[PDB]
């Protein structure tokens, strides 16, 4: 099977440069045209650049022309994307994609995609989250089901991982996708529903891990 | 440099259904159109190439048609593995993509259970107040959440987040988070979120009084 594995993503400040790599196996890389394509939630899929099998011809998307350089090293089965003058628009998942390999057609698209590598263009500094309990008012609860959770606020960059009771509580857990707050820092919540009758017999602890800052927080969520 | 208009943006289907997705090019592209499938966190996968050619290993229930400017992907006898997002791509003049079509699971209407969480004392001591409203386990995805402070409608100080459709019960959950300074939080008494959803006979408001 064709395999494409990208690397080099991470956090980079506006105006700076970064190089992505893509290592190919399972086909004759030196015979294949290759692409970069990037993805954002708000703009979708956007072609970035193509390079001919032998590196002799290159084309670029209009908005990266003059800022990005595509290159390859056939002796190493590796494709590169050098990015410079980085802008907010450039934050994305970057995919390596092989040009369509068959020869029945004289116009060419693309076939196999890599797994992607994430590029975050941001001026924010690495920061671990503040973790706050989510407990509804004890005076207004009703219906036999209780909701509780943890607010995981003001961290950078993604990701955080959350468990409950060290993994012993999985059913009814919803850990929401993070949102990028106005500050440039991320925030999310993790909630869980449990029997209202269980708040007096079962301790609930959210375990919050943030590897970029080397932070672990365990927060007991107390009935209010 | 060709604009691809894909429709619809979302559609709901059941196992066994026949699904059609359209894609219109802003200029003629002959048969140079491809269809890709993508699941969350994963890479796109080529299904159909050159408008109608089923690629190797792709189930025969996928088919494509069209030439010129109008193209259609059809999924017959929709299976559990087919719930995903689909993209068209023209490869006549450089490479551009449609906006995507999310094919999600149809189920019966389920109203949200609505909960409201006041800010914690720990957070208030730090100078900020976040109020969280939770809409749990509802279907369909479309919901309206409005914040009220002393019965005045709020704007621009809330962010929403939504889960992917649940693999077991096919529902969604959603959070809305209102952020205020500690000082502004302490200026007002009643904090409320009002929820409108097809499964509710009328909008439901959950609220609390600051300090209760």
């Amino acid at each position: 099977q064709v395999q494409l594995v990208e690397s080099g993503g991470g956090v980079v400040q506006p105006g700076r440069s970064l190089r992505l790599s893509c290592v190919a196996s399972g086909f004759t890389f030196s015979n294949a045209g290759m692409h970069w394509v990037r993805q954002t939630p708000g703009k979708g899929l956007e072609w970035v650049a193509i390079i001919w099998y032998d590196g002799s011809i290159k084309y670029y998307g209009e908005s990266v022309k003059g800022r990005f350089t595509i290159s390859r090293d056939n002796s190493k089965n590796t494709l590169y994307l050098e990015m410079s003058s980085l802008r907010a628009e450039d934050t994305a998942v970057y995919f390596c994609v092989r040009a369509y390999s068959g020869s029945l057609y004289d116009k060419y698209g693309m076939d196999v995609w890599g797994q992607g590598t994430t590029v975050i263009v941001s001026s924010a500094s690495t920061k671990g989250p503040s973790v706050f309990p989510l407990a509804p008012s004890s005076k207004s609860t009703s219906g036999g089901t209780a909701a509780l959770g943890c607010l995981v606020k003001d961290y950078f960059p993604e990701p955080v991982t959350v468990s409950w009771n060290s993994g012993a509580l999985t059913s009814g857990v919803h850990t929401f996708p993070a949102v990028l707050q106005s500050s440039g820092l991320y925030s999310l919540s993790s909630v869980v529903t449990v029997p209202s009758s269980s708040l007096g017999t079962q301790t609930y602890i959210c375990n919050v891990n943030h590897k970029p800052s080397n932070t672990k927080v365990d927060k007991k969520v107390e009935p209010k | 440099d060709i604009q691809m208009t894909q429709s619809p943006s979302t559609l709901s289907a059941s196992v066994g259904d026949r699904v059609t997705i359209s894609c219109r090019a802003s200029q003629t592209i002959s048969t140079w159109l491809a269809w890709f499938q993508q699941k969350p966190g994963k890479a796109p996968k080529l299904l159909i190439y050159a408008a109608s050619s089923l690629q190797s290993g792709v189930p025969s229930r996928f088919s494509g048609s069209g030439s010129g400017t109008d193209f259609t992907l059809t999924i017959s006898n929709l299976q559990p593995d087919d719930f995903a997002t689909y993209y068209c791509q023209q490869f006549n003049s450089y490479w551009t993509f449609g906006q995507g079509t999310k094919v999600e699971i149809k189920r019966t209407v389920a109203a949200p259970s609505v909960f409201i969480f006041p800010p914690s004392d720990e957070q208030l001591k730090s100078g900020t107040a976040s109020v969280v409203c939770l809409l749990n386990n509802f279907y369909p995805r479309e919901a309206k959440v409005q914040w009220k402070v002393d019965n005045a409608l709020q704007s621009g100080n809330s962010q929403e987040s939504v889960t992917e459709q649940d693999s077991k019960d096919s529902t969604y959950s959603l959070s809305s988070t209102l952020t205020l300074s500690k000082a502004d939080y302490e200026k007002h008494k009643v904090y409320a979120c009002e929820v409108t959803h097809q499964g509710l006979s009328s909008p439901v408001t959950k609220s609390f009084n600051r300090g209760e």
């Binding site: 294949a32 045209g33 290759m34 001919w52 040009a99 020869s103 698209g109 | 003049s93 450089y94």
Partner: peptide
Amino acid sequence: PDPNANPNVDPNA
């Protein structure tokens, strides 16, 4: 030049 022409080895090579 055509950016969408064959960017692979010539199939008749």
